[PDB]
Amino acid sequence: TNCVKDENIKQIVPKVMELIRCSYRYHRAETPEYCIMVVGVPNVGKSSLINSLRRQHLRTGKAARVGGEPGITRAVTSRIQVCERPLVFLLDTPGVLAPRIESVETGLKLALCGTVLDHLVGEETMADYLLYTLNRHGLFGYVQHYALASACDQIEWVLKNVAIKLRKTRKVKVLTGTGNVNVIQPDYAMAARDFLRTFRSGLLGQVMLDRDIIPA
Amino acid sequence: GKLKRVLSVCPEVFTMHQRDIDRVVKVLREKCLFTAQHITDVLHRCPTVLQEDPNELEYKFQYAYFRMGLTHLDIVRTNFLQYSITKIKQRHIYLERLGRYQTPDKKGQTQIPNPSLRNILRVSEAEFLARTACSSVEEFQVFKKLLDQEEEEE
Amino acid sequence: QFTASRLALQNFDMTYSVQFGDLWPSIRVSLLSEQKYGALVNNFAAWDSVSAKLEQLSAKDFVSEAISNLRCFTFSRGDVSRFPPARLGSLGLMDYYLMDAASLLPVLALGLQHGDTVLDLCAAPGGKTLALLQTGCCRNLAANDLSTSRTGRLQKVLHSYVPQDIREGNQVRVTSWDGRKWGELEGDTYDRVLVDVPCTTDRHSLHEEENNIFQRSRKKERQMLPMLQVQLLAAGLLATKPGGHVVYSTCSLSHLQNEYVVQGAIELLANQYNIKVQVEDLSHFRKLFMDTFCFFPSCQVGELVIPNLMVNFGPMYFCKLHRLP
Amino acid sequence: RARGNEYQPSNIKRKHKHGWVRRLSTPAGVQVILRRMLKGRKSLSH
RNA sequence: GAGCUACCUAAAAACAAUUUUAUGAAUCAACUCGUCUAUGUGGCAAAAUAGUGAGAAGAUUUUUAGGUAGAGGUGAAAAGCCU
């Protein structure tokens, strides 16, 4: 389901009802109201899905503080009405990550999509993973969006030019033999942050991070 | 143009005493809270309202507003007032008892979609039962006889 | 917030509607609409008088058409006329008893025969007793009911209709004891047993707020009704003599309370007590009573009387079981 | 802020509000004078 | 009791320099305000002081006289103000 364009969201509600009927409600069999729960890792659009269904069916409006950085909804929320005809309510939950994320490569994909805060991982390290993945995939969307060169696979090289494109610079202390001197330098950090934002905004192009695993 | 249809439908309006006309208009403004435009529209669309005595129209409107939850705009467009009270009560309850029609709840949401207001009243009895209720004509005749007896007891 | 009637309607919509599907609309309105009453004659001195008077009213005994010892005059199909209030006879006995026609089918179905001993567990003032008494030309009887006040009026009814001499005979015995406990008391004692288990009384539950099984406080009882029904039905099966016939009657339309109860009880008797029950088919009985009653054949066991707008005599679910050994 | 300085003296304001001519304007004001004369006050008004 | 304060009427006054332009725009004094921290806590003070901050040609600030009074007045609504 595409939340922003509400692609196929209508299909979810009939499926939700169909599965419930086959299953035995047990204690809640007599209760007419239907309550459902949405749970996932942070920044997967859980809250916006509740709002999207609410507007699509009940056409009322936002019922969740949607935000662009993980951690918006801190805890559980009261039942949110979704559809009057089946009287189905959605229960919002905060994103939860298991402490074990298997290989570190999975974390990079998890960080790339924004599920985990970019601070602890570091945009600079993440920015490299984007270049490797995009180059391996061959989707050279960035070169058109960022007019740097035909192609490149050096993280340092791409960061240098894009900063010039954005006209971003900063003053950074650089250790040298004769002392510590604050010498102006291109703003690499902004390039990583700005580059990362474009990828998740779709400017670079659609990607399949796990393309290698389909053959299995 | 508005007057000619009203004049033709109910010529006695001119002969009718000022009290009768004022009471009918006063009820809508002070007891039904109809908007000024709607009040003029209601008289034009169904001029028979003036013929009806006061304190019976008010019950008729409250039946639509409260029992059926319909808004003021809905009543004017569908011309509920022209239809007789007996016909509305028989059909509306029959639908309600059959589960087709539910009065909107406090939150304003109906679990099961209601049927078109025009379908309930405008269509003929044969078409009404055939489509709205999907029941036999003979059974409806029994219901009308049953409902009347209950009203007499009430 | 919700009244007991509102909750009762809610349960049928979620459960009963699914069971009957497209038939539910007519049944739903039927229950809300006023019930149809059928006058039952008291026989005795007024035996001829009431029959002639009822003919003037244009009421026709559906039993008489079925034949073409109980006769119950009823109004014509689709007739909404109301029978006049019952009045006392010359001898001091009420001329007729107003009751639901379907309520008399369990008695007519039980195949009452002369020289029999009959038990009426949880009979209450349901009218079947009085009707059964009129059938009991030569049949010792017995009445039981858990409550007292409920049973208190039952005696008043007997006083009004049953003559004192007949009541004085041991034939008429009134008691108020637990049905399940009653099974041990008199095992294999009564050839014919009519068991009317307490049910949800859907028609009464919707109309009447008082003593409504769907009240929130009474939640515990409602859930346990199927278990209680099985035990009472099992108690009757224990009490019936070898080769006896028993009829189990349930007012409610519920599939759980009607078909699973009877079949489950038969299984319980077969396993624990090693007893066998022979199923009996009343389809022929249905054919005779089609004019005055409408049934639906979906039920595997039992003959439920669906309330219809043309014939609003429902709901009665009665199944007859014969004790094989 | 700091309270306590509500009194912002103005002779025109003072005499208009609680003056002799102001008091005599209304009978309710004249009865203020009449009571003050009964008590024995040095000054009957401003 | 509206000399405090909310609001209004009338008669008046203040606004440097700089950049935009032609303005409830910008930097920032006079001036208005009162975000933050610290001290104070019978304190200088029954709400201040030291820093730091917001606005500063406008829905601006200020002065003088008058009007609205408690079952009420006023309120860019805090049940805020009315010694």
Added chain:
RNA sequence: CCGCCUGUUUACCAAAAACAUCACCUCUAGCAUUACAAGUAUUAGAGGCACUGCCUGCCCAGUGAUCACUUGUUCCUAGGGACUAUGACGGCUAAACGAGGGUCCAACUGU
């Protein structure tokens, strides 16, 4: 993230996301010698709501086809006449602005 902006508020514990605000929407009133107003519907009062292009409610007699029937509504008694020629909703611009609530990098430092 929240509010569109400048602005306003609990004097003496909250200056905000709250109030106001332009624009938009709803209701009421056809009028004079003390408010409104020496005014008159493009006006005045009352209240609601950020606006702006775009998706978007229902509502829109039926069948023949500007024409006849079937309906509907009324009467006179089941008959006879008479008459009937997109607006309560969302995404949201989108930018800008903020002694607002959260963050991150850099420099900086006795934190």
Added chain:
RNA sequence: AAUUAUAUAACUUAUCUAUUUUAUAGUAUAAGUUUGAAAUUUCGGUUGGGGUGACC
């Protein structure tokens, strides 16, 4: 919520002044009917606190 309610508006019969042979006008008032701006007064008891059940 209970009791009232010449704030207003309304209409009805009267009083009353014009008028036409009964009639339609109005009304320094009274008696009603209808709305309610308001005024007045109240917050039973038992359930280890609370909503629901209840019970006296």
